Design a protein around this ligand. Structure first.
Ligand SMILES: [K+]
Lengths: 419, 415
């Protein structure tokens, strides 16, 4: 709880992290795995930053950083250009999503000898189901590939960033909460509520920004505006209704529609936000990945190294492609194209943040409220397996992408038959 | 369950503060007073945010944002321009600062019937004596002033913020029961150390940043380095070598040397830093002023409104003038210019932040306060009077200086 300690660790993380990411850019290497390696170094390996401390810091700086990425990911692109391929986008972002998390659940259960009905694995998949846009952002921009593919991937990524949280949020209820009577109910409540309220405040902010020239004063407006969405979203509203919506998805929706409203209409206030959030997103990017590599326990790491790695392989090579094929069985896309989408989309920062947040929320709450069937496995090793599994998933997917990009892009974008 | 609610209140402060700031910017009036009024509105008046909870959040986010503000002015300041008026600046942050402090504290003690040696008054002065550049900078250029007084007042207003904090921490040591070391020792310790380590990290960062184009990645690098300096100075190092170390002044120094070096080396990485800090420094500047108005309790107002008022005027019309004149007693400037320096020294962000910090530091860690200075005045009354006093001081100084700025510049700085 030592604030100065937290500031110190965050400081070292930001310094060494920024340096590392800079080196990564200087060598065209993805920053992510290097950040993770650093996290492991200063984490268990050197014991500069202990686990519990990192957990307590992340308990505070978690949602804050998470609110940044959603914003930055919502302003990086707009939805006025999706009208061409929005169908493929939606199907790939919903059906492929659910299927992927399901199969990944099967794998996660079948690996750790957990029952195939274990909510643990399904939680893991729900976390890892979302992909990372900024990861594939340089690797498509430098290519400037067939715009369909590019914007399809961007749309899928940005749109799956919130749902993953929502999916994770719903499944967590099974592990013990104030209600969680039925997952579908809270899914509708969260999604629909976030859509409604988020779009409400989106319209409000739209009209309130257009009529003036806030300029530099836009930053405190949206950020705090997003901050309000969390209180009203997760803490406050249940106190008066029990139900509610995911504040994060509400933030994503609000910021997205707001960006597109600041782009359909043309306000100069727009250009600040993007440049603001992008710089703001970069902090949370560096901050989360390093702390993910610190929350690992050396013993737990050695215990679940091999299985998690194998789980990751199941996700990348089996889950993702299968979900792609099954989600796009009625598409106008080539087999080589579907295969492209399959071996493309990697995971990133959202599954990391969600992983650690799940770990701490379980350890802090499920210690008091452990589901019986689940309690047969120590919540300790639940959080351990989820966190390390997500870790190796991120790592493996990212490096695999780093070796995939060029070769696959050339070898799979060849045909494009004209009708 | 405190976290999400803290996010809520803080976010509300950010939104409402933003809107208010825009309103003020439109009506050609400063944002600060309206922000304080807003804080009072959602504070005691509407009771949207309980004072205890406000102070509770400020315990966390307070020190955080304080790094932003200090980082803000740091990069805006460049050294190569000061060399012509630096002799004036040095005095404006040394002797003038000390005198303003001693006199403001003197009057503060005299008002509430406290002995002229009561550390409470001098604490108030320590908090108050720091002039703010964020209210001078948008105003100075608009009124087409001479360059030198603009550069001068900017330099003073910037250099004050660290020295205000340092002095605030030093005097705080006297409010420490279990130990009361030599003031001068702590002063030279914190200051000198800040200079040293500041220059060190600023040199490292100089080479690192100059060598390659960091672009956006300066933000975590610099902020992290800043974050790093506080933990060393205000936690680790004293737990190790025993002797203290100021983090804030070190941070400010670092921003100064680094910024000036990058500006001198024409490294475009400089701007990427400035854009980042300016926004952050704007974020907390809103967050600070709002919470100050919320930390105040209704009782504090209905028991210390008028006393804090009288104290405020003393700081503005008696303290700072005498400080300026006596500081520049041998200067070769002009009487009109001296009066201009005197009548333009708004108390801004830093005095507010220090007022809240000290406020919670005293109110919470109350029982272990020395009884010598407690017998005269209740610690609750101490915190309340310092907070209110700083509040009235800031409001009055900003409003008066802003309303009189034009006429002041008109009939003074024409040599
Ligand atoms: K450079």
């Amino acid at each position: 709880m030592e604030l100065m300690m937290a500031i110190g660790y965050l400081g070292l993380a930001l310094v060494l992290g920024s340096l590392v990411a800079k080196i990564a850019e200087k060598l065209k290497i993805p920053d992510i795995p290097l950040l993770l390696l650093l996290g492991l170094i200063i984490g268990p390996f050197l014991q500069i930053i202990p686990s519990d401390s990192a957990m307590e810091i992340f308990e505070y700086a978690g949602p804050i950083g998470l609110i940044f990425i959603l914003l930055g990911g919502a302003f990086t692109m707009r939805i006025s250009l999706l009208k061409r391929v929005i169908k493929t986008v939606v199907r790939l972002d919903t059906i492929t999503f659910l299927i992927t998390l399901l199969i990944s659940g099967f794998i996660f259960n079948m690996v750790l000898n957990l029952p195939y009905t274990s909510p643990v694995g399904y939680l893991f998949g729900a976390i890892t189901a979302a992909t990372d846009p900024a990861t594939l952002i340089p690797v498509f921009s430098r290519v400037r590939t067939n715009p369909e593919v590019a914007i399809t991937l961007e749309a899928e990524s940005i749109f799956n960033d919130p749902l993953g949280i929502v999916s994770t949020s719903v499944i967590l209820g099974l592990f013990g909460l104030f209600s969680s009577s039925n997952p579908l109910i809270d899914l509708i409540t969260l999604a629909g509520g976030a859509i409604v309220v988020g779009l409400l405040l989106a319209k409000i902010y739209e009209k309130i920004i257009i009529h003036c020239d806030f300029h530099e004063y836009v930053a405190p407006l949206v950020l705090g505006g997003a901050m309000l969405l969390l209180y009203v979203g997760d803490d406050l509203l249940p106190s008066i209704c029990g139900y509610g919506f995911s504040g994060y998805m509400a933030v994503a929706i609000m910021g997205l529609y707001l960006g597109d409203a600041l782009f359909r209409a043309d306000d100069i206030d727009y250009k600040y936000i993007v440049s603001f959030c992008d710089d703001l997103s970069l902090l949370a990017r560096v901050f989360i990945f390093v702390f993910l590599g610190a929350c690992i326990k050396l013993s737990m790491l050695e215990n679940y190294f091999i299985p998690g790695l194998l789980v990751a392989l199941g996700s990348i090579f089996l889950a993702r492609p299968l979900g792609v094929f099954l989600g796009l069985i009625g598409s106008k896309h080539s087999f080589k194209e579907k295969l492209y989408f399959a071996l493309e989309g990697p995971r990133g920062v959202v599954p990391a943040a969600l992983a650690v947040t799940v770990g701490i929320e379980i350890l802090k709450n499920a210690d008091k409220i452990p589901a019986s069937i689940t309690k047969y496995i120590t919540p300790t090793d639940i959080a351990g397996t989820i966190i390390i599994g997500t870790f190796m998933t991120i790592l493996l997917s990212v490096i695999l992408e780093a070796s995939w990009a060029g070769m696959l892009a050339l070898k799979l974008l060849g045909e494009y038959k004209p009708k």
